[PDB]
């Protein structure tokens, strides 16, 4: 049994394993204290304002406050609720019995006499937009310039989606319990989380591991990287065909091809309309760039047979970067994919012309790599409806029997059963050519023997990690430099 939420995990740990809810709440609060100390150093000179709601997030806040008593310069709780859950009441009682001061009125000037704000207003129990007293207070904290530490989730972020519910706390440090929440991973939530620490508060480890949606980590990618046996030859490491480019878009094939080669693929062949095919070997003569005779500079049905022939002697086919999107391309792409009995990595213009019926009838696997504009056009929805919409991505992958790689600052990788989130990268990747590289990487890892899902997982991590290794300002990163950085990213991963 997998478990979508910490709510189910908490309940089981209490009701079935028998851990008192108060023990979990104590472990949560002391983990916030320890995290603060790792981040601020010695706490003894700081004055803390702890903002508590009436739920168990506020209860966690009372634990924090009580544990700082007598050890820091000052502690004050502002209790912002109208009533208290039983564990919140218990820890409120402890805090007062230990000598702690609580007020129920928030005075704007109160921020002046404190150094650190502990945000324990709302956690996973947030429901609906924040207004009123709560909102004014959150807005005052965000204008204050103080150090902000959020308990579980910054108040105002929907922990299931990462959306802001009218307004939300911007934290320097967020301490979350058991596992990261989706709202720490997706934006805008990811941005408001600041530095995220995930604390073990005593849940059984197999329940924590029962979660079906994961952040892609360095350790996970290290274990998936294929082996390089010494006694090998190029065929050991697979062969990729890339069907890409047009008279309009001559550069895309080059970036995709080198993306396959830089991740260790043995042989890469491009099929590109003549004379644009010669661009590729002029820059990188280790590529094979086959000239395709076209009528007007674009792939059409007249090239169907030659592409299928070239596919026979490769392991994987990538298609789409720079193809263009007119009727002749659409007929070619769909007839080709319908007939191709090899794994396919489908990107860019091949997605824009794709008939999703074709995916349903394919026996061989596929990875699709849309950005949200492409995904939107693919399922006929708005960009705002598909962006960071992991449930829709899962549904699409399951219904069409593919892996879907929905690119954004956080990239979602899913086969419909398992969903992985990638958080490596930076804004240098928000630039033409970046996606073309990733397409090559994925096809390359598939050719080397990784499953479509594994190939996609490793590729999105390494593509973002390579961007982070760029030595100058990220806004100056281009795809050609990203390519150069891939082998360093691989070395560092090991």
């Amino acid at each position: 049994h997998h478990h979508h939420h910490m709510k189910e995990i908490d309940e089981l740990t209490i009701k079935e394993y028998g851990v008192d809810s108060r023990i979990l709440m104590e472990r949560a609060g002391i983990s916030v204290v320890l995290a603060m100390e790792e981040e601020l150093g010695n706490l003894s000179d700081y004055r803390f304002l702890v903002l508590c709601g009436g739920g168990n997030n506020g209860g966690d806040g009372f634990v924090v406050a009580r544990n700082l008593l007598g050890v820091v310069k000052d502690v004050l709780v502002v209790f912002l609720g109208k009533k208290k859950t039983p564990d919140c009441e218990y820890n409120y009682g402890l805090y007062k019995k230990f000598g702690g001061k609580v007020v129920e009125q928030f005075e704007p000037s109160i921020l002046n006499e404190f150094d650190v704000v502990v945000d324990a207003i709302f956690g996973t129990g947030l429901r609906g937009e924040i207004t009123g007293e709560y909102a004014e207070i959150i807005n005052l904290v965000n204008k204050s310039g103080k150090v902000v530490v959020s308990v579980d989730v910054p108040s105002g972020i929907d922990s299931n989606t990462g959306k802001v519910l009218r307004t939300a706390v911007k934290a320097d440090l967020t301490v979350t319990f058991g596992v990261p929440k989706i709202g720490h991973i997706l934006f805008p939530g990811r941005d408001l989380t600041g530095k995220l620490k995930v604390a073990n508060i005593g849940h059984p480890v197999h329940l924590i591991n029962s979660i079906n949606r994961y952040v892609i980590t360095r350790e996970m990618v290290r274990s998936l990287l294929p082996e390089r046996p010494r006694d090998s030859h190029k065929g050991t490491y697979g062969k990729v065909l890339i069907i890409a480019g047009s008279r309009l878009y001559s550069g895309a094939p080059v970036l995709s091809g080198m993306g396959s080669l830089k991740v260790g693929t043995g042989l890469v062949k491009l099929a590109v309309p003549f004379p644009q095919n010669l661009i590729a070997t002029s820059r990188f003569p280790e590529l094979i760039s086959v000239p395709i005779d076209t009528e007007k500079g674009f792939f059409s049905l007249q090239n169907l047979q030659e592409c299928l022939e070239l596919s026979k002697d490769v392991d994987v086919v990538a298609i789409g970067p720079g193809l263009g999107n007119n009727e002749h391309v659409r007929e070619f792409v769909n007839e080709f994919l319908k007939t191709l009995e090899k794994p396919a990595v489908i990107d860019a213009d091949a997605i824009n012309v794709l008939d999703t019926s074709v995916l349903k009838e394919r026996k061989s696997p596929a990875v699709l790599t849309p950005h949200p504009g492409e995904m939107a056009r693919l399922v006929k929805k708005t960009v705002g409806d598909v962006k960071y919409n992991y449930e829709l991505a899962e549904e699409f992958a399951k219904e069409n029997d593919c892996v879907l790689v929905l690119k954004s600052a956080t990239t979602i990788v899913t086969d419909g059963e398992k969903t992985l989130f990638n958080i490596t990268g930076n804004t240098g990747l928000s630039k033409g050519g970046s996606g073309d590289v990733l397409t090559g990487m994925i096809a390359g890892f598939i050719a080397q023997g990784l499953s479509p899902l594994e190939a996609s997982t490793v590729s999105v991590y390494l593509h973002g990690f390579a961007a982070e290794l760029f030595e100058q300002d990220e806004r100056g990163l281009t795809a050609s430099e990203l390519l150069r950085l891939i082998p360093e990213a691989i070395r560092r991963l090991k």
């Binding site: 204290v33 320890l34 100390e37 790792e38 150093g41 010695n42 706490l43 544990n67 050890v71």
Partner: peptide, 8 residues
């Protein structure tokens, strides 16, 4: 030295 938890 942070000493919320431990005195040496």
């Amino acid at each position: 030295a942070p000493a919320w938890l431990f005195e040496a």
